[PDB]
Every structure is written in structure tokens, then in C-alpha cells.
Design a protein around this ligand. Structure first.
Ligand SMILES: OC[C@H]1O[C@@H](O)[C@H](O)[C@@H](O)[C@H]1O
Ligand SMILES: OC[C@H]1O[C@@H](O)[C@H](O)[C@@H](O)[C@H]1O
Ligand SMILES: OC[C@H]1O[C@@H](O)[C@H](O)[C@@H](O)[C@H]1O
Ligand SMILES: OC[C@H]1O[C@@H](O)[C@H](O)[C@@H](O)[C@H]1O
Ligand SMILES: Nc1ncnc2[nH]cnc12
Ligand SMILES: Nc1ncnc2[nH]cnc12
Ligand SMILES: Nc1ncnc2[nH]cnc12
Ligand SMILES: Nc1ncnc2[nH]cnc12
Ligand SMILES: [Ca+2]
Ligand SMILES: [Ca+2]
Ligand SMILES: [Ca+2]
Ligand SMILES: [Ca+2]
Ligand SMILES: [Mn+2]
Ligand SMILES: [Mn+2]
Ligand SMILES: [Mn+2]
Ligand SMILES: [Mn+2]
Lengths: 250, 253, 253, 250
């Protein structure tokens, strides 16, 4: 039984693949531009992935890996009335590049289900792109498409830490993504049956992608303060979670 | 950091304690004294707990423990229109016997707030009382008493497998409780910040407290398929978060 | 797969089974008695076990558990030329009482093969008994007897920390025991095949046993400063090998 | 504290840095070359390192990591009269390329102390080499030289699995290595203090390195069947060996 595990509490540039604006300053993973004044910049795009690829399904054995991630992220907008665009946890082909700038989160191209990009994402959306987005701020599960397969309402607590837990099991295939805001004592959850064999290639890079506005004044920070991940691929023909969550939060 | 953990996928009496009306047999944890036919009996009080007491907060350093738990439970009633009452993931004192049955869920004596009780539990309510309860079916936390302050909405599933995740964080005192239906997708979550140094004592028996009503018309069951738990007691003024990504994979995944 | 683990970087009473002279003093498991002036006492016997019975083999499936323990102990003798008798990690029946003191270490009655004792022990022996002992300080594997089935040489450093690791890989049926004195850069290792199915019962108590000498001059402390444990019992297949790597970091540091 | 772990009970090319003759064959790491029919080739060298760099020590804080690695290997020589050379678990610089083959195990160049190497290794040596080696088969601790600063005896059994555990306790500076031949009940151990802040860079790649004999007769299989590892680096300011040696090594 193959295992892979890491937990962050402070970040480093060395054990990550950093694309575009993604920078590590003062131990924090800043996926988008943050100037030498403390101001978020619009038009910024960035990607951060773990240096070691992960096997999420095996063809010759037929088994799918069961994984889980947990990260504390902070979105700080000077104007909560004009924010864009958000951040997402993603699984993408090992050396795959970011795509469209802004509301596409540097992950997808269009609203259609296109498995040439082979990208599963869990988005945290703070802007109404409308044609594919629901009314307000939302957590969405993305499958080859920026038009989320399922979405849940999100009371976006600006400038406040957001603690996420995303879990995938092999017997249930239910990709579950939750978010808590301890300062506002709130909690939200998304759950949909996703199958990784059909969508993602055998080996992927896990990590993050975040963007800012296509406008001039649509600015926010998109920081990750900590990150845990663990995966287990069963050999021949459930996983332990409880022990995973504390590993980072606790 | 003092650690304690375990993962049940097949239960045993040898590593479980019983109180009042509990029973452990046949590959699963049937907390209510179930007859051969499958009959829920009213006027009961099931109490299954792990043998080791689990430390919540230290005196010598003054550090709170962060814990996590995951279990797969079912609430089954032959009549859906009359369900009472359900169970609650209890953290009761070791040197304390179960209390009043029914609405009090075998945990408390009175509806009023009293620190003498020393019991925090995550309920999976089914019956409408209202004197200490909200509007309908609810998943909530019980602090020092049976009367809640904030709960969540939850549709009452009948004869459905549900996987539960409950966690506590020392840094923010936040107790987060979730519940997922693999088949129905009906996933719900609740969170609330309550200080446990003021409420709970130092050592508690952790497990499942089950109960029924005072009438045969309102009857239901209490069953657990698999159980997991972890706890972490921080050393010297940490106020940090425990790992959770690796935990849920131990039991559930 | 059923699992059970704990890490005691500091000790407490409520999760242990203390027998005879074993006490928890200021976070330390002081197994044998010490005077209010810091003076070790002769004719002492002490036992401390984990409050949860640990299943090391299943009868209904024929599967054997894989388990691992680590602990740091410290044997502080007023004089090095007169020490006795040592301490041991042992697996014993759930309700087992302390046996003979001294050279028997509270675990055994004789040097002959006593199958009814049902005890596997890893001894850290600081007294040459001759009736069974090798000539110098030694680690031994004890199967239903104080006459060790195998031994190795232990260059014991008086009053210095001993870092111990004991693993049992069920598939190979091999028990391996190692001791490290980090102050002197010394290391020792013992390994021998032991079949748990015919020696030990299904459920066991896991912990410690220690004694001082039977003469007033031959005295020592037998303290355990920290103790971590892990066990993984499979469902139907014989077993899967345990992950030792992440153990110490999460257990011993 | 930051944590990093993995368990390889079955190997893959995707999460390893393969160098020279080392390759994954049927889910096993064959470090030196071996024919389809089983016979190993002479004069070979192989290396395998994990994809993500591991932080052993931190410059500004002074804080040093505690790590533990467990692996099972199999050394099978067609003839016990002519075996060479051996395998080692080593920590090297990030962009480290293989050095001198044969007796130097692909980790060193000369018998003298050279700092430019920045390499800490645990050798398992089956050939009595020249100006460095002790009289019999031996485990060794290699600190910037093929001449081990401390060795212990190792009764090697041809073609029998060897279970290895290596640990580093930061607070005592102690590196401990153990080898067990479970098939014949034998066990071996060595321990020596090593200052890794003097020797190793802040970031190191961990893994293996093995060589076959520089003469045509001196052949052996240099196989690694499983490999588990974990590291723990604190934030400000010991590892549970119980759980590790299992979850990973079982
Ligand atoms: O206000 C900022 C927005 O600008 C829009 O043109 C774009 O569709 C969005 O993705 C967002 O960037
Ligand atoms: O409908 C039965 C009810 O009986 C009441 O006396 C009791 O307080 C309730 O908890 C409920 O069980
Ligand atoms: O001098 C102390 C010794 O006394 C003997 O009677 C006993 O058998 C030894 O184990 C040791 O205790
Ligand atoms: O004959 C085999 C030997 O050949 C030597 O020249 C070499 O130094 C050794 O490493 C060993 O390979
Ligand atoms: N990802 C997840 N978030 C919240 N609760 C869960 N229970 C199981 N998986 C979960
Ligand atoms: N117990 C819990 N269930 C679901 N999501 C969580 N996030 C943090 N704790 C959680
Ligand atoms: N207990 C143990 N000590 C040393 N090396 C080992 N290899 C496997 N188990 C071991
Ligand atoms: N690597 C190791 N091998 C054997 N015993 C140990 N005790 C601590 N570390 C050890
Ligand atoms: Ca959007
Ligand atoms: Ca009620
Ligand atoms: Ca003796
Ligand atoms: Ca050599
Ligand atoms: Mn969206
Ligand atoms: Mn209620
Ligand atoms: Mn002896
Ligand atoms: Mn050598």
C-alpha cells in the first residue's frame, strides 16, 4: 500500500513548483501579486504545485487512490464590493500550464466539459461571472469545466482565515469539500460523486491556482498559510481521515 | 505532545465499556438492546465507551487538547412519522453515571445551564420537544445542559448509511461536525465556539450515548459500523491546529 | 484493519493500570520505589500497563497483529557495582497479577518452560543471576520463562537515558529489540522468532515490569520517561508490514 | 512543525529521480543492471532519489530536522566468492550527479575527506576495498568519504531480504542504522554522532546508490523492494518510531 504525506505550517520555494506570479514571502504562499506596500494587484495569475507527482488511479490493478487535503487560506480585499477572482485547489497533469486569466482561475478555457485539459478543481469563488456562476460567493467542484458540476453558498468572510478539507474516497467516489470560518463560526459543504479514471490521467500534480481581476480596481490577496495532503492507493482488490485533519489544524 | 488514537472497523467488547443499557455483539455496535426481530425498545439508555479516559485540558501547563473522530451510524425507524430520540457523541466523566432518559438523552438532569453536568455531545435529533430544542430535526452541540444555543438544519434520513466527521480545535475552540450520505449526497455541517476548560473536566470517557422515549409509538435504533478517533494535547502555550487530512483516511478512507 | 496507538511524552495515572509499587511522580513512570530523599529501595516490585486490552491475534480469522513500541527509560543506581534487577516490556493476560520479585522481574516464577504464564517479555537485565543469565548486563527475549531464549550484550551506562524500540512483524514472526544510549553513541540489537499464537492469549495487557534487589545494597531506580505504542491487526489477510519511519518523529519526537 | 512522508511498497518511475543504470522493473527498484533472465551486469552504477527536496536544517532558526527511513533490499550474487560492491542510503545536494563507481558506490571520488561532496551515507558494503575498508562485511556511516568514520560487522546472507531502519535524532545528533535478516533471525546495529549542519546543505535529496564490481566476475543484484520515509522540521524552538516502522514498513 503506497502512501504519500506532507503538512505545511510555513512555506518554502524549494519543495514547490511555482508558476507565474506565485511567490513565497515571510513563510506564506502568495499565489497572486502583493506589492512592496501591501497592496494586491489586479491582472495577476499564479500556480503552486507539490514537486512530487501523485498517482490517483492505477490501470493495471483497477484501483483508485483515496486522498485528502487541508489548507488555511486568506483572501484580503481592500474593497469587498469589487473583488476578483478567487483561488482553487486542483489536480492537473504533472507539467501542465495555466490557461485563461481571471474568472477562469488559470485552470480552464470555457464553460464546456473538455477533458483535453484533464483538470479536476475545487474552486472558492468570490466573483459573479454569471453565465456559469450562481448568484453569490460560492464553493464549486470543477470537472474539466469552469462551470462547476455542483456549487454551495458561501458567506465570504473577507480578510479572515478559511480552513478547508477536501476528501475523496474510492468506495463512494464522493468528492467532498468543506470550508469553515472560525472567526465568524460558520461552515459550508459541497459533495458530488466524481470518478478520477474518466477525468484525470494516472499521475497528477496537486496544488493551487489563483487570480485577480480583469478590471483595474478588482483586487484581492490569495494566500495559503498552511497545507496538508495525504493519499493511499489500495493494492489488489476505506482510508484514515480523523488522523489527517489534526495533523494540520491541531 | 501526548497522543492517543484508534481505528475500529470491526468492534469488540474487550476494548469497550458499557453503562446502564448498552450491548456489544455481532460485528456491529448496536447501542440499544435490540430484539431478534429488530424491535426498538422504549425506556432505554445505551452507553458505549472506549476503555481509556481521554485528557481534554492540562492543569500543570494549561493547554487544551485538539481531537478528531469519524464514525458511520444509522437511525432506523419502522414508522417515519414518529421518531424518538437518537444518539449523541458523548464526552462524559468517568466517575459519573448516566442521567435522565428521553429528552435529556441520558446526559443531563435539568434543562437549565449548570456546570455540574460536565457533558458535551453532538446530537442527531429526531423528536420535536422545543423546550430546549429549535424548530425541527437538527444536528447540534449540547453545552453543560440539554438546551442548545446554535444548531443546524438536517433532513432526517430513514435507513441510510451516514459517515460522520467531528473535530475540535484548541486555537479557536471551534467544534465542527459534519455528516455525509454516500448514496444521497445530502451533506450537512455545523460549527460553534465553546470553551471546554470552563465546561468539561480533565478526563472523560468518549463514545456513544443512545436513548429512547417514554412511549412505544415513538421508537428507533442506534448502530455504528466503524469508528475512529485521535487526540493531541499541546505542550507549552502552542494554540495551534492539529492534522486532519491524514486522520479521515485512517477510519473512513 | 483495526488499529490502536498512543504516545506518552508525559505520564498520567488514569490511562494506566498501576500494580504494587509503581507510581506516577511528576510526569515520570517511577516503577520501583524511591525515598523522599531520592534513595532507591530494595525488595521493590512495580508494574504499569495500558488501560486498553490490545488484541495481538484473532482466533476467528487466524490473523496475527503487527505491533511496535518505543520507550526511553533510565536506571539510576547509587553504586554501579551493586545494581539489581532491571526492567522489562511485557505482554501479559488481561487480568494477570505480579509474580516473583528480584531476578524474575515481576513476570515469572521459574526458569523452566511455564506455558500457563502466557507472557512474552523483552528484559533489560542489570544483574547476573547465573541460574539462567549470561555473564554481563543484557537484553533478553523471554518466552514463558526468565531463562531467555536469546540474549545480547548491553553496555549499560549508569543513570543515562536508554532509547528502546521493539517491533514484531507478524508475517516473518520476528521480534526485534534495540537499545541506544545517545549520551555515549552506543547501540545494541536482538532479534528472534517468537510465535505469539501459542504463547500469548488473544487479548493482552501491554506495559512495564521492574524490580530492585533482594539485598539492601543492590538498589536502583527503574523509571520510564516516555512511551509510545502502535499496533495494526488485519481483517482477513495474514498481515501488512507496519511503517516504522513516521513512528519516532510522531512518537519519540 | 513541517512534515514530509511517503511509503513505497511498490516503486514507480514518476516519483523518483533515476540516474544512470537505475530503473523501475515490475514495481521494484533495480539499481544496477540485470538481464531479463536474472543475471546482473558488472561495472554498473545506479541512483534513485525522491522528487521533492527534504529540509534537513534551517539557516536562520538553526533548527534541524529529525528523520527516519525504512527499506527492504535484496542482494543476490551468482557466486559468493566474487561479490561487489554494495548499496547505500545517502543524502546528497539537490543537483547531485553520480560520482566514482565500484568501491566508491557512486557517492564519492577519493578515500580522503572532501567537503565539496556534502554527502552523508549509510553504506552496506559487500567488498573488502583498499585504503579504507574493515576486514569483513560491514554497515558503515559515510561522512564526505568512502572511508566510514564508524563501522559495525554485518553477516551478509546471499539473496535473503535485509530489513533496514535508519534514524536521525536532532536533539542528540545521533544517527542510528540497523539491519535485520529476518530469514535467519540475525540483527546488526551501529550509531555515531554526525553534525549535518556542517556537512549537508539546507535542502537534500534522499534515496539510494549502488554499484556492481569493476571486474567482469564480481556481480550482484542491487534490489530495493520497499521504501518508507518521514521527516519532521520544527517551526520555532523526536519521532514516533512505533507508528512509522509499521504504517510504512508495515
Ligand atoms: O471585475 C473583474 C472581472 O472582469 C471581468 O471582465 C471578468 O470576466 C472576470 O473574470 C473578472 O476578472
Ligand atoms: O412522545 C414521547 C415524549 O415523551 C415525553 O414525556 C418526553 O419528555 C419526550 O422526550 C418524548 O420522548
Ligand atoms: O543482591 C540482590 C539479588 O538477590 C538475590 O536474592 C536475587 O535472586 C537477585 O535477583 C538479586 O535481587
Ligand atoms: O574485482 C572487483 C573489485 O575491483 C576493484 O578494482 C575495485 O576497486 C572494487 O571496487 C571491486 O569492484
Ligand atoms: N471533505 C470533507 N469535508 C467535511 N466533512 C467530511 N466528511 C468526509 N469528508 C469530508
Ligand atoms: N469535523 C469537521 N468536519 C468537516 N469539515 C471540517 N473542517 C474542520 N473540522 C471539520
Ligand atoms: N525493532 C527493530 N529494531 C531495529 N531494526 C528493525 N528492523 C525492523 N524492526 C526493527
Ligand atoms: N534506526 C534505528 N534502528 C534501531 N533501533 C533504533 N532506535 C532508534 N533508532 C533506531
Ligand atoms: Ca467566478
Ligand atoms: Ca430532543
Ligand atoms: Ca537477572
Ligand atoms: Ca568496499
Ligand atoms: Mn464559480
Ligand atoms: Mn436538541
Ligand atoms: Mn536475564
Ligand atoms: Mn566500506
Amino acid at each position: 500500500a503506497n502512501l504519500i504525506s506532507f503538512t505545511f505550517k510555513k512555506f518554502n520555494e524549494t519543495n514547490l513548483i511555482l508558476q507565474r506570479d506565485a511567490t513565497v514571502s515571510s513563510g506564506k504562499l502568495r499565489i497572486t501579486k502583493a506589492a512592496e506596500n501591501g497592496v494586491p494587484t489586479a491582472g495577476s495569475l499564479g500556480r503552486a504545485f507539490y514537486s512530487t507527482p501523485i498517482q490517483i488511479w492505477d490501470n493495471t490493478t483497477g484501483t483508485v487512490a483515496s486522498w485528502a487535503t487541508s489548507f488555511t487560506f486568506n483572501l484580503q480585499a481592500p474593497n469587498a464590493a469589487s473583488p476578483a477572482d478567487g483561488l482553487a485547489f486542483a489536480l492537473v497533469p504533472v507539467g501542465s500550464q495555466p490557461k485563461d486569466k481571471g474568472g477562469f482561475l488559470g485552470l480552464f478555457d470555457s464553460k464546456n466539459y473538455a477533458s483535453s485539459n484533464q483538470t479536476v478543481a475545487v474552486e472558492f469563488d468570490t466573483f459573479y461571472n454569471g453565465g456559469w456562476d450562481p448568484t453569490e460567493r460560492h464553493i464549486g467542484i470543477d470537472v474539466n469545466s469552469i462551470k462547476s458540476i455542483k456549487t454551495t453558498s458561501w458567506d465570504f468572510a473577507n480578510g479572515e482565515n478559511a480552513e478547508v478539507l477536501i476528501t475523496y474516497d474510492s468506495s463512494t467516489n464522493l468528492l467532498v469539500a468543506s470550508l469553515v470560518h472560525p472567526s465568524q463560526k460558520t461552515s459550508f459543504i459541497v459533495s458530488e460523486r466524481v470518478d478520477l479514471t474518466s477525468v484525470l490521467p494516472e499521475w497528477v500534480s496537486v496544488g493551487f491556482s489563483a487570480t485577480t481581476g480583469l478590471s483595474k480596481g478588482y483586487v484581492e490577496t490569495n494566500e495559503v498559510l498552511s497545507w496538508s495532503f495525504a493519499s493511499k492507493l489500495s493494492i489488489n482488490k476505506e482510508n484514515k481521515l480523523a488522523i489527517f485533519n489534526l495533523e494540520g489544524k491541531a
